[PDB]
Amino acid sequence: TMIPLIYHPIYSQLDLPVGHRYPINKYRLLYEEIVRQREQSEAWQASFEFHTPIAAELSRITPLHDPDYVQALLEGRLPAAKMRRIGFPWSKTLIERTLHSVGGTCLTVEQALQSGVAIHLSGGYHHAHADFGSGFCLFNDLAIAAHFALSLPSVDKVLIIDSDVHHGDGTATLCAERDDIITLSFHCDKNFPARKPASSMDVGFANQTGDEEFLSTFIQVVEMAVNLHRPDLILYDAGVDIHNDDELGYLSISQAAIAQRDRFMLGLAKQESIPIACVIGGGYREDHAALVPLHLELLKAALLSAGY
Ligand SMILES: O=C(CCCCCCC(=O)Nc1ccccc1)NO
Ligand SMILES: [K+]
Ligand SMILES: [K+]
Ligand SMILES: [K+]
Ligand SMILES: [K+]
Ligand SMILES: [Zn+2]
């Protein structure tokens, strides 16, 4: 009944202009909120433990990403226009953060294999492709972690379930020609990115889709994809940019429905005895801390699911 949480203090240590769209403080604030829950509550103290990652090895990245793309980012030589498409100014701290977060999704996988359920307090970089970055993504932690997971003995088949409001295009292109990683994306069709190469299965929702349509579809599609593919491991992107107050997403999902989504996902994995490694994914609010209660729903779901 232990739930590993994966966190590194470098996650919010990036220097960004104010006004920058990326809610860089949410990671440390979410971590601090959980630290406070643990002081307040015997249940949170007893049910969760933290695991700090070290940077991912470069050999774990280059099976998915082009080496010259990797090298250009390592050396801060990525052409200016390509770096802007990523959406961050280059710095060594950005590279160190990224590699640590990739390491973290990989650790979440090992931890999920051991305990059943593990949550990464970062991650979900589904817009990175083999040879370019976009949409705040440099390297694709989900695909990287799925490829790594397949190196392990118990795992032959990985299902990535992406509930972030944006299409997992990078993940789609990275896994399109491999039958050992299956990609499922739910998303708002009119949100970024414009071009949506096929996942294994895609569910695109109209603007202002609300709780019942989203949840009924999520429940049935996920249950089907789990039955169809019988994965050894699920990677679950629990992005909260589906939320009705998100500043980028165009869906109308409530915090209550986010909770029900996470409860359902985690409860299915448990019922089926499939290890599930979770990434908190995206979320956009100029009030970065406003994302904290939305992401915390994943933890409340895991807490309830584990039996407290
Ligand atoms: O959370 C997300 C990130 C979505 C990426 C942001 C969408 C819009 C965007 O990146 N536009 C853009 C980028 C560079 C320059 C101008 C616009 N996906 O999971
Ligand atoms: K294997
Ligand atoms: K998605
Ligand atoms: K595939
Ligand atoms: K919205
Ligand atoms: Zn998103």
Short mmCIF file of C-alpha atoms and ligand atoms in Angstrom, two decimals:
data_model
loop_
_atom_site.label_atom_id
_atom_site.label_comp_id
_atom_site.label_asym_id
_atom_site.label_seq_id
_atom_site.Cartn_x
_atom_site.Cartn_y
_atom_site.Cartn_z
CA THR A 1 0.00 0.00 0.00
CA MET A 2 2.97 2.33 -0.64
CA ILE A 3 2.67 4.86 -3.49
CA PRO A 4 6.05 6.06 -4.80
CA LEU A 5 6.16 9.76 -5.76
CA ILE A 6 9.00 10.91 -8.05
CA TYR A 7 10.32 14.47 -7.61
CA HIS A 8 13.54 16.45 -8.07
CA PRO A 9 14.02 19.98 -6.65
CA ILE A 10 15.32 21.13 -10.04
CA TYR A 11 11.78 20.78 -11.48
CA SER A 12 10.78 24.37 -10.74
CA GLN A 13 14.28 25.91 -10.80
CA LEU A 14 14.08 27.39 -14.29
CA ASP A 15 14.50 31.12 -14.91
CA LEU A 16 11.73 32.32 -17.17
CA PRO A 17 10.38 35.80 -17.93
CA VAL A 18 7.23 36.58 -15.96
CA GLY A 19 4.38 36.42 -18.42
CA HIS A 20 5.98 33.21 -19.81
CA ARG A 21 3.19 30.76 -20.60
CA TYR A 22 4.78 27.75 -18.85
CA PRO A 23 3.63 27.37 -15.20
CA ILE A 24 7.11 26.49 -13.96
CA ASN A 25 6.31 26.92 -10.24
CA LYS A 26 3.57 24.26 -10.19
CA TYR A 27 5.95 21.41 -9.60
CA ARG A 28 7.53 22.71 -6.41
CA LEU A 29 4.20 24.03 -5.18
CA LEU A 30 2.52 20.65 -5.75
CA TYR A 31 5.45 18.95 -3.97
CA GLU A 32 5.20 21.42 -1.02
CA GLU A 33 1.42 20.88 -0.84
CA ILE A 34 2.03 17.15 -0.55
CA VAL A 35 4.71 17.68 2.05
CA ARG A 36 2.08 19.61 4.04
CA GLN A 37 -0.53 16.86 3.58
CA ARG A 38 2.01 14.42 5.09
CA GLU A 39 2.48 16.59 8.22
CA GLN A 40 -1.31 17.08 8.60
CA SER A 41 -2.42 13.54 7.88
CA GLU A 42 -1.37 10.08 9.12
CA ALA A 43 -2.84 8.59 5.93
CA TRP A 44 -0.65 10.75 3.65
CA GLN A 45 2.40 10.21 5.90
CA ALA A 46 1.99 6.41 5.82
CA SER A 47 0.81 5.90 2.18
CA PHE A 48 3.34 7.95 0.10
CA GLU A 49 7.14 8.09 -0.09
CA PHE A 50 9.43 10.25 -2.31
CA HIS A 51 12.12 9.09 -4.77
CA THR A 52 14.53 11.59 -6.30
CA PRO A 53 15.82 10.68 -9.79
CA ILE A 54 19.23 11.23 -11.26
CA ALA A 55 19.62 12.40 -14.87
CA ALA A 56 18.74 9.88 -17.57
CA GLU A 57 21.72 8.42 -19.42
CA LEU A 58 22.09 9.73 -22.95
CA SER A 59 21.93 6.13 -24.25
CA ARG A 60 18.31 6.05 -23.07
CA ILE A 61 17.45 9.11 -25.19
CA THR A 62 19.19 8.39 -28.49
CA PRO A 63 17.10 5.23 -29.32
CA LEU A 64 14.13 7.62 -29.69
CA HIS A 65 15.75 10.95 -30.65
CA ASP A 66 18.15 11.85 -33.41
CA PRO A 67 21.73 12.20 -31.97
CA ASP A 68 22.49 15.49 -33.72
CA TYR A 69 19.22 16.97 -32.30
CA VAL A 70 20.27 15.67 -28.88
CA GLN A 71 23.78 17.00 -29.20
CA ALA A 72 22.58 20.42 -30.38
CA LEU A 73 20.44 20.77 -27.25
CA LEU A 74 23.25 19.52 -24.95
CA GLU A 75 25.62 22.13 -26.36
CA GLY A 76 23.08 25.01 -26.57
CA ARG A 77 23.55 25.14 -30.38
CA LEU A 78 19.93 24.47 -31.42
CA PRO A 79 19.02 27.18 -34.01
CA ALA A 80 17.07 30.03 -32.47
CA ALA A 81 13.89 29.35 -34.41
CA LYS A 82 13.87 25.67 -33.38
CA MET A 83 14.43 26.64 -29.73
CA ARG A 84 11.54 29.10 -29.89
CA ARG A 85 9.30 26.37 -31.30
CA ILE A 86 10.16 24.44 -28.16
CA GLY A 87 9.04 27.56 -26.25
CA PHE A 88 11.86 27.97 -23.67
CA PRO A 89 15.08 29.98 -23.79
CA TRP A 90 18.04 27.59 -23.81
CA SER A 91 20.11 27.21 -20.63
CA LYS A 92 22.13 24.44 -18.98
CA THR A 93 19.50 24.35 -16.22
CA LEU A 94 16.83 23.57 -18.87
CA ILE A 95 18.88 20.65 -20.12
CA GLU A 96 19.62 19.44 -16.59
CA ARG A 97 15.94 19.74 -15.65
CA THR A 98 14.81 17.88 -18.79
CA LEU A 99 17.26 15.01 -18.35
CA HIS A 100 16.34 14.67 -14.67
CA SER A 101 12.60 14.62 -15.55
CA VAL A 102 13.19 11.96 -18.25
CA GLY A 103 15.08 10.02 -15.56
CA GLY A 104 12.08 10.58 -13.31
CA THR A 105 9.54 9.07 -15.71
CA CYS A 106 11.91 6.07 -16.06
CA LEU A 107 12.09 5.76 -12.30
CA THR A 108 8.33 6.03 -12.02
CA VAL A 109 8.17 3.02 -14.33
CA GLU A 110 10.55 0.98 -12.13
CA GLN A 111 8.64 2.09 -9.06
CA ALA A 112 5.27 1.20 -10.62
CA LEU A 113 6.61 -2.25 -11.54
CA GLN A 114 7.59 -2.74 -7.89
CA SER A 115 4.54 -1.25 -6.09
CA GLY A 116 1.71 -1.34 -8.71
CA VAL A 117 1.21 2.45 -8.89
CA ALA A 118 3.77 5.30 -9.06
CA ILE A 119 3.35 9.00 -9.77
CA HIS A 120 5.79 11.38 -11.39
CA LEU A 121 5.32 15.00 -10.27
CA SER A 122 6.50 16.10 -13.75
CA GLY A 123 6.58 14.63 -17.19
CA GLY A 124 4.27 14.10 -20.15
CA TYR A 125 6.40 15.65 -22.90
CA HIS A 126 4.34 14.27 -25.75
CA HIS A 127 5.19 16.95 -28.31
CA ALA A 128 8.79 15.94 -28.79
CA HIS A 129 9.42 13.99 -31.99
CA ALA A 130 12.52 12.02 -33.06
CA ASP A 131 14.31 15.04 -34.49
CA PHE A 132 12.59 18.12 -33.25
CA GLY A 133 11.02 19.64 -30.16
CA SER A 134 7.79 21.63 -29.77
CA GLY A 135 5.13 22.63 -27.32
CA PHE A 136 7.45 22.85 -24.26
CA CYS A 137 8.86 19.38 -24.98
CA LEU A 138 12.53 18.63 -25.72
CA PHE A 139 12.64 14.87 -25.32
CA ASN A 140 9.67 12.52 -25.07
CA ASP A 141 9.78 11.03 -21.58
CA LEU A 142 6.75 8.76 -22.26
CA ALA A 143 8.25 7.11 -25.32
CA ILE A 144 11.69 7.00 -23.67
CA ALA A 145 10.25 5.37 -20.57
CA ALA A 146 8.16 2.92 -22.65
CA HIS A 147 11.30 1.90 -24.64
CA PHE A 148 13.20 1.49 -21.37
CA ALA A 149 10.36 -0.44 -19.73
CA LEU A 150 10.55 -2.95 -22.65
CA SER A 151 14.23 -3.62 -21.78
CA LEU A 152 12.96 -5.11 -18.49
CA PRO A 153 12.04 -8.81 -18.20
CA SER A 154 8.42 -8.56 -17.06
CA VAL A 155 7.40 -6.10 -19.83
CA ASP A 156 6.65 -6.98 -23.45
CA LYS A 157 3.85 -4.51 -24.21
CA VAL A 158 3.33 -0.92 -23.06
CA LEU A 159 0.14 1.17 -23.41
CA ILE A 160 0.46 4.97 -23.22
CA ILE A 161 -2.81 6.63 -22.20
CA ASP A 162 -2.69 10.37 -22.79
CA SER A 163 -5.55 12.38 -21.18
CA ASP A 164 -3.81 15.74 -21.54
CA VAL A 165 -6.05 18.05 -23.60
CA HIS A 166 -3.47 18.26 -26.42
CA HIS A 167 -2.80 15.52 -28.98
CA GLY A 168 0.27 13.32 -28.15
CA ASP A 169 1.69 13.87 -31.64
CA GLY A 170 5.33 13.27 -30.76
CA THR A 171 4.49 10.09 -28.96
CA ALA A 172 2.34 9.05 -31.96
CA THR A 173 5.17 9.50 -34.50
CA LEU A 174 7.73 7.85 -32.21
CA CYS A 175 5.62 4.71 -31.72
CA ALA A 176 3.76 4.48 -35.04
CA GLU A 177 5.84 1.62 -36.50
CA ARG A 178 6.30 -0.47 -33.31
CA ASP A 179 3.68 -2.94 -32.04
CA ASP A 180 5.22 -3.19 -28.55
CA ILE A 181 4.15 0.36 -27.62
CA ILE A 182 0.49 1.37 -28.18
CA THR A 183 -0.66 4.99 -28.01
CA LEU A 184 -4.08 6.26 -27.04
CA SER A 185 -4.75 10.00 -27.02
CA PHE A 186 -7.79 11.91 -25.86
CA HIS A 187 -7.70 15.59 -26.80
CA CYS A 188 -9.46 18.70 -27.91
CA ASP A 189 -9.43 18.67 -31.65
CA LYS A 190 -9.07 22.42 -32.11
CA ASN A 191 -6.16 22.69 -29.63
CA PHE A 192 -2.49 22.54 -30.71
CA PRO A 193 -1.04 20.83 -32.60
CA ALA A 194 -2.67 21.56 -35.97
CA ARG A 195 -1.33 18.33 -37.51
CA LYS A 196 -2.24 15.21 -35.58
CA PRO A 197 -0.46 12.06 -36.91
CA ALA A 198 -2.42 8.92 -35.88
CA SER A 199 -1.88 7.35 -32.51
CA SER A 200 -2.98 3.76 -32.25
CA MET A 201 -6.34 5.37 -31.42
CA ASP A 202 -7.40 8.98 -31.19
CA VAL A 203 -10.48 10.53 -29.54
CA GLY A 204 -10.91 14.17 -30.40
CA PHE A 205 -13.52 16.19 -28.55
CA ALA A 206 -15.37 19.30 -29.63
CA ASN A 207 -14.78 22.63 -27.88
CA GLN A 208 -16.55 22.90 -24.55
CA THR A 209 -17.09 19.15 -24.16
CA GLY A 210 -18.27 18.60 -20.57
CA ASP A 211 -17.99 15.97 -17.86
CA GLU A 212 -20.40 13.20 -18.92
CA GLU A 213 -19.30 13.00 -22.56
CA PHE A 214 -15.62 13.04 -21.54
CA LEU A 215 -15.92 10.48 -18.71
CA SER A 216 -18.29 8.02 -20.46
CA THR A 217 -15.95 7.98 -23.47
CA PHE A 218 -12.74 7.86 -21.39
CA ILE A 219 -14.06 4.90 -19.31
CA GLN A 220 -15.17 2.81 -22.26
CA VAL A 221 -12.26 3.53 -24.62
CA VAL A 222 -9.61 2.93 -21.97
CA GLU A 223 -11.30 -0.32 -20.84
CA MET A 224 -11.41 -1.53 -24.41
CA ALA A 225 -7.76 -0.57 -25.12
CA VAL A 226 -6.63 -2.38 -21.96
CA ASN A 227 -8.62 -5.51 -22.95
CA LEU A 228 -7.39 -5.32 -26.55
CA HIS A 229 -3.71 -4.85 -25.89
CA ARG A 230 -3.26 -6.58 -22.51
CA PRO A 231 -0.27 -4.27 -21.65
CA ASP A 232 2.32 -5.25 -19.09
CA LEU A 233 2.63 -1.56 -18.14
CA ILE A 234 0.47 1.55 -18.52
CA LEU A 235 1.98 5.02 -18.81
CA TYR A 236 -0.81 7.43 -17.84
CA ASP A 237 -0.57 11.18 -18.66
CA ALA A 238 -3.07 12.85 -16.29
CA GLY A 239 -2.72 16.33 -17.72
CA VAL A 240 -5.23 18.78 -16.16
CA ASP A 241 -5.42 21.19 -19.12
CA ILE A 242 -8.82 19.55 -19.84
CA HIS A 243 -10.08 21.69 -16.95
CA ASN A 244 -12.76 24.23 -17.71
CA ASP A 245 -10.57 27.12 -16.43
CA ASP A 246 -7.42 26.11 -18.34
CA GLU A 247 -6.00 29.05 -20.29
CA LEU A 248 -4.93 26.95 -23.30
CA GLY A 249 -7.36 24.02 -23.43
CA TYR A 250 -10.89 24.38 -24.87
CA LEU A 251 -12.69 21.65 -22.89
CA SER A 252 -15.10 22.22 -19.98
CA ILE A 253 -14.14 19.45 -17.50
CA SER A 254 -14.68 20.01 -13.77
CA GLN A 255 -12.16 19.27 -10.98
CA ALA A 256 -14.70 16.62 -9.80
CA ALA A 257 -14.57 14.93 -13.22
CA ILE A 258 -10.73 15.02 -13.19
CA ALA A 259 -10.94 13.19 -9.88
CA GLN A 260 -13.33 10.62 -11.30
CA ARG A 261 -11.05 10.16 -14.35
CA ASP A 262 -7.99 9.45 -12.10
CA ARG A 263 -10.02 7.22 -9.75
CA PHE A 264 -11.28 5.21 -12.70
CA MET A 265 -7.90 4.87 -14.39
CA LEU A 266 -6.02 3.82 -11.26
CA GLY A 267 -8.84 1.51 -10.13
CA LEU A 268 -8.89 -0.25 -13.54
CA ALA A 269 -5.14 -0.81 -13.50
CA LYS A 270 -5.42 -2.27 -9.97
CA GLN A 271 -8.40 -4.50 -10.79
CA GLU A 272 -6.48 -5.84 -13.84
CA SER A 273 -3.18 -6.06 -11.90
CA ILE A 274 -1.38 -3.87 -14.42
CA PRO A 275 1.44 -1.62 -13.10
CA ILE A 276 0.63 2.03 -13.83
CA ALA A 277 3.20 4.82 -14.05
CA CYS A 278 1.58 8.29 -13.99
CA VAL A 279 2.84 11.67 -15.20
CA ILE A 280 0.98 14.82 -14.19
CA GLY A 281 1.30 16.33 -17.67
CA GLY A 282 0.09 19.75 -18.64
CA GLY A 283 -2.00 22.59 -17.20
CA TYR A 284 -2.02 26.34 -17.93
CA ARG A 285 -2.90 29.12 -15.45
CA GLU A 286 -1.06 32.40 -14.88
CA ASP A 287 -1.81 31.59 -11.24
CA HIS A 288 0.47 28.57 -11.35
CA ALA A 289 -0.62 27.38 -7.88
CA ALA A 290 -4.20 27.07 -9.17
CA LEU A 291 -3.06 23.86 -10.90
CA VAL A 292 -2.03 22.31 -7.57
CA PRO A 293 -5.51 21.10 -6.42
CA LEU A 294 -6.16 19.71 -9.92
CA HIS A 295 -2.97 17.61 -9.95
CA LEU A 296 -3.53 16.62 -6.29
CA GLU A 297 -6.66 14.76 -7.48
CA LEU A 298 -4.36 12.09 -8.94
CA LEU A 299 -2.80 11.58 -5.49
CA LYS A 300 -6.19 11.50 -3.76
CA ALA A 301 -7.24 8.87 -6.31
CA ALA A 302 -4.14 6.75 -5.65
CA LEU A 303 -4.63 7.17 -1.88
CA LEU A 304 -8.27 5.95 -2.00
CA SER A 305 -7.38 3.18 -4.48
CA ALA A 306 -4.59 1.87 -2.21
CA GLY A 307 -7.01 1.51 0.74
CA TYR A 308 -6.95 4.56 3.04
O1 LIG B 1 0.63 21.23 -22.38
C1 LIG B 1 0.86 21.11 -23.58
C2 LIG B 1 1.63 22.16 -24.35
C3 LIG B 1 0.97 22.71 -25.55
C4 LIG B 1 1.92 23.59 -26.33
C5 LIG B 1 1.47 24.99 -26.48
C6 LIG B 1 0.53 25.19 -27.65
C7 LIG B 1 0.76 26.44 -28.39
C8 LIG B 1 2.19 26.64 -28.87
O2 LIG B 1 3.14 25.97 -28.46
N1 LIG B 1 2.31 27.65 -29.77
C9 LIG B 1 3.47 28.33 -30.19
C10 LIG B 1 4.75 27.85 -29.98
C11 LIG B 1 5.84 28.60 -30.40
C12 LIG B 1 5.64 29.85 -30.94
C13 LIG B 1 4.37 30.36 -31.10
C14 LIG B 1 3.28 29.61 -30.71
N2 LIG B 1 0.66 19.99 -24.20
O3 LIG B 1 0.56 18.86 -23.42
K K B 2 10.91 -7.22 -22.06
K K B 3 -3.87 13.82 -25.14
K K B 4 2.76 1.54 -31.80
K K B 5 -10.88 25.42 -20.78
ZN ZN B 6 -1.44 19.82 -22.84
#
